[PDB]
RNA sequence: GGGGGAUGACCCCAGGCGGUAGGGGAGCGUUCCCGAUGCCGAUGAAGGCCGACCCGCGAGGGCGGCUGGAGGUAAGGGAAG
RNA sequence: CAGGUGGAGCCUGGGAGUGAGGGCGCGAGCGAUAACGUCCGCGUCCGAGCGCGGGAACAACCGAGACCGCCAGCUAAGGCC
RNA sequence: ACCGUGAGGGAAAGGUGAAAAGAACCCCGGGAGGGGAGUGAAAUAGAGCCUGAAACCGUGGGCUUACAAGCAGUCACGGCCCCGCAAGGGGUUGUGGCGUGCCUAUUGAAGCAUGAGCCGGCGACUCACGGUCGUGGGCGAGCUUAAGCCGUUGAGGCGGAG
């Protein structure tokens, strides 16, 4: 091996285009079945998570 | 006393810079590549300058051949039958005249089919 | 009813009410120049000629002038040659008034 | 006094029959028609053409020994990837795109060259679409 | 420059340009090339151009009706407002500059502090002084030894 | 009316932080109270605080009223770089830019007749 | 270059006017000095940022707006980090 | 001896730069009646006219010596499906 | 400081405001920071403080771009946006024409030959004494003083050895 080195300083049309899929997705989430507050579903709340089985005790 | 660069080069630069609003990635930011962008810009602002010249005229040919072909001849002759006719006064740049005038041109068709025989 | 007129090594075709600006000739603005050259009538069949005689147009100068400066640069790589001069080329404008048959 | 040009107008059709034409010298006038050089008011930047529907396309006619000789090329992008096509060859499989060829190198090359190969619908045998006015020309 | 001669860098190899000290011009904090160094601005006038040009600028206040030669003053015993005085009698308001020339050490004091005048010793005369001020005054000792400098 | 915040010299890198910024720009305070909490970056903890004392800062100061405000301006500007050496191999010693936002939430009120 | 006899900067007329090494000529600008015990300046210095405007062939100079907050420095000449 | 007033010529002086040339034509030598070879001669162009047109593109082949401007005209070489 | 065993090498780094009046108190916050409040002629003079350029990063707006290909410009026309009574101009770019970076070194470079990431600031024909020409003046069979002496708000004079 040698010693690969970039040719060309990178336009900044360059680098903005490469980034052009880096951006962020919301987290998706859905409205807690008791409590008032957002969840990701399948999870467990923060607030009093699930009925049948014992939840992590907020309550 | 010692004259250090102070204002000038700034100055200087800037004015260049400004010519050089518009163009693409550095060449409008980077003093370097607008002046160097510039030196082309400007030869080809004169060349170009001695060629709208040509520019222009090779369209009204174009444009004369077109409409008296409708009228059954080359623009190689009419030029010639006009030649003789007298009728040099040209043109070529009117041709709105071919457009926008048709039996003026017309006119100017049969004056020029009718010369030297 | 236009006209076909030659002034200055140029041709344009006028009517009456017509702001043209053309080469720069000699006259005091307000004075009236009949360029006493048209090559063409409006009316068709009246043409020919080099110009018809008889037939002038009248326009009055408007007052002369210098054109918008075009900066003429020239440049030659590798012989360190670079030119600059600004060029303003002067016109004089008139208005068309009269197309004298 | 600025040089006159058009405003948007009409694209008129025109209708082209090509049985016993030659080729080029049929493919010259497809051009100029195509580009509209035949109108007063040509302008180099827009084209204003007609647009030209050619039928009877598998019947263009061409002369010497071309039919066996003449050999279209085509370099796939792999070795040994250049197709050798005779004249013969192709008429019998897509006839026309003979002409299709012939125009296409004869319009100008760029964005609007090819724009102006659109507007050239060629056919085999009789017939074609009947849409616009299509004024027979010879 | 304070800095040592050592060199730099090697020179080759380091893949860095190339030096030897930094007392070198090329380096910021460097030596200066070619700056000034103490000198004397100082010629030799031919010393008949000097005696021409006195004659000549006196010359030039004369052709001008602006050259005085007064006796005596009175408003001598040095006080700027005695001075002030006798000048407004002769005719100076100070509307114009006025280079004072006399040996009398208290009518140089006198007018010394004025904005508008300038003043010397007849020994003195010298044509930048002539030139600067709008008016030449002189008294008569003063323009003995002027008449005395010149031929 | 529009209230503010701005967090200045959060010792983190912009393009970090710019990113979970735009995943709240234009949106109403309690989605974007509800994005941050689930949002798994280390951006989003210092986002939030901006945007929170810039809710904060609407209600009491600008009277405001908390039920009403999206976010209607955010953005991270860069500030001043931590230079540190970063010893390297064959005696080589880089050096790392431990780089600085300062972020910027703008709140204003959703228009609600 | 020739006339015009204003002694040029001014108007006619005729020419010449690609250029590296290089020779010659005229200008612009920066720092400092005289001009200055002056003049411009908080009704806003220098500097900065805009300008599609004016003058100059050009280097440049103006002018207007914004910023800036205490300096700047004609005409004409001198000297150079 | 005549024409020839030319960015001609001669004399005295100040300042240079250059002393790596190249292609092409023609005339020779060397070479193999090789070389985008080499060496001279006489000419030319590039050099410094990698500015313009022609030769697909192309320093030096053909055309032609670019002071500036014009949406005017005639041509050169080479061209006119 | 730092670097070197040592001799030795050897830096960066100035500026709020007239005055600290250097921002009580409240709010978000663990703090940092900021929002109000207040001070101030001014607080994008707020102490990471005069001015605050450029490269560089970013938010918002206008024009534009996913069947075109290129030293990135230029000439022309057209579209959309802005300014303007108008004519006119500024912006942007769709298509068309044209188009081989700058410097350097060379017979010859876009050159697949040298140098340059970009921006700011530093950076290279000087001065002394002789010489040789030219030029502006002074005096001309003459021209001219050196050291030094006197004298001076940055005053000049004398001095003839040479
Ligand atoms: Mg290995
Ligand atoms: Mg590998
Ligand atoms: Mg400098
Ligand atoms: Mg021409
Ligand atoms: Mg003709
Ligand atoms: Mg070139
Ligand atoms: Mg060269
Ligand atoms: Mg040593
Ligand atoms: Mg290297
Ligand atoms: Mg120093
Ligand atoms: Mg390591
Ligand atoms: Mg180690
Ligand atoms: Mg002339
Ligand atoms: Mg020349
Ligand atoms: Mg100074
Ligand atoms: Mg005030
Ligand atoms: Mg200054
Ligand atoms: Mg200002
Ligand atoms: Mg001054
Ligand atoms: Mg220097
Ligand atoms: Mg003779
Ligand atoms: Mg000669
Ligand atoms: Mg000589
Ligand atoms: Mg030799
Ligand atoms: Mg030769
Ligand atoms: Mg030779
Ligand atoms: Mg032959
Ligand atoms: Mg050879
Ligand atoms: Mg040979
Ligand atoms: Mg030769
Ligand atoms: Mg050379
Ligand atoms: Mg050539
Ligand atoms: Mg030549
Ligand atoms: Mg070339
Ligand atoms: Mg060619
Ligand atoms: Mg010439
Ligand atoms: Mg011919
Ligand atoms: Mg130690
Ligand atoms: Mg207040
Ligand atoms: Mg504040
Ligand atoms: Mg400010
Ligand atoms: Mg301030
Ligand atoms: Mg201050
Ligand atoms: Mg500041
Ligand atoms: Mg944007
Ligand atoms: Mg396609
Ligand atoms: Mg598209
Ligand atoms: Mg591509
Ligand atoms: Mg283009
Ligand atoms: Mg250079
Ligand atoms: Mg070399
Ligand atoms: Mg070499
Ligand atoms: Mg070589
Ligand atoms: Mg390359
Ligand atoms: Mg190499
Ligand atoms: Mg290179
Ligand atoms: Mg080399
Ligand atoms: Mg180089
Ligand atoms: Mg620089
Ligand atoms: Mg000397
Ligand atoms: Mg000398
Ligand atoms: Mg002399
Ligand atoms: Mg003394």
New interface residues.
Partial sequence: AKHPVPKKKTSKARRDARRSHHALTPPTLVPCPECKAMKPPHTVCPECGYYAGRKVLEV | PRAKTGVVRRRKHKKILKLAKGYWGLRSKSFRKARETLFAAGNYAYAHRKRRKRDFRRLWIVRINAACRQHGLNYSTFIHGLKKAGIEVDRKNLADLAVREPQVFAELVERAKAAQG | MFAIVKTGGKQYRVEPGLKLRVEKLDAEPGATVELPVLLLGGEKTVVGTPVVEGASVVAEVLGHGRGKKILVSKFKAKVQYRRKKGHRQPYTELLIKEIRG | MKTYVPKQVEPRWVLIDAEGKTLGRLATKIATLLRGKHRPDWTPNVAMGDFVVVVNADKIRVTGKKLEQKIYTRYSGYPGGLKKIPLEKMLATHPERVLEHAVKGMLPKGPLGRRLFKRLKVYAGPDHPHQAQRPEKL | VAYSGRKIWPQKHTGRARHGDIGAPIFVGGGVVFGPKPRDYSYTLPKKVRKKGLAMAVADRAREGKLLLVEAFAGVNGKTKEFLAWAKEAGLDGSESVLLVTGNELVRRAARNLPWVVTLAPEGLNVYDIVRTERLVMDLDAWEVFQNRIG | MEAKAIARYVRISPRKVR??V??IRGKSLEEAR??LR????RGAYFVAKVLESAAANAVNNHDMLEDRLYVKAAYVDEGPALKRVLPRARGRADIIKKRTSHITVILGEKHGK
């Avoid at chain 6, 689930?38 to 970056?41: A, E, F, I, S």
């Fill in positions: 990113l979970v735009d995943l509800n994005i689930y949002t798994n970056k």
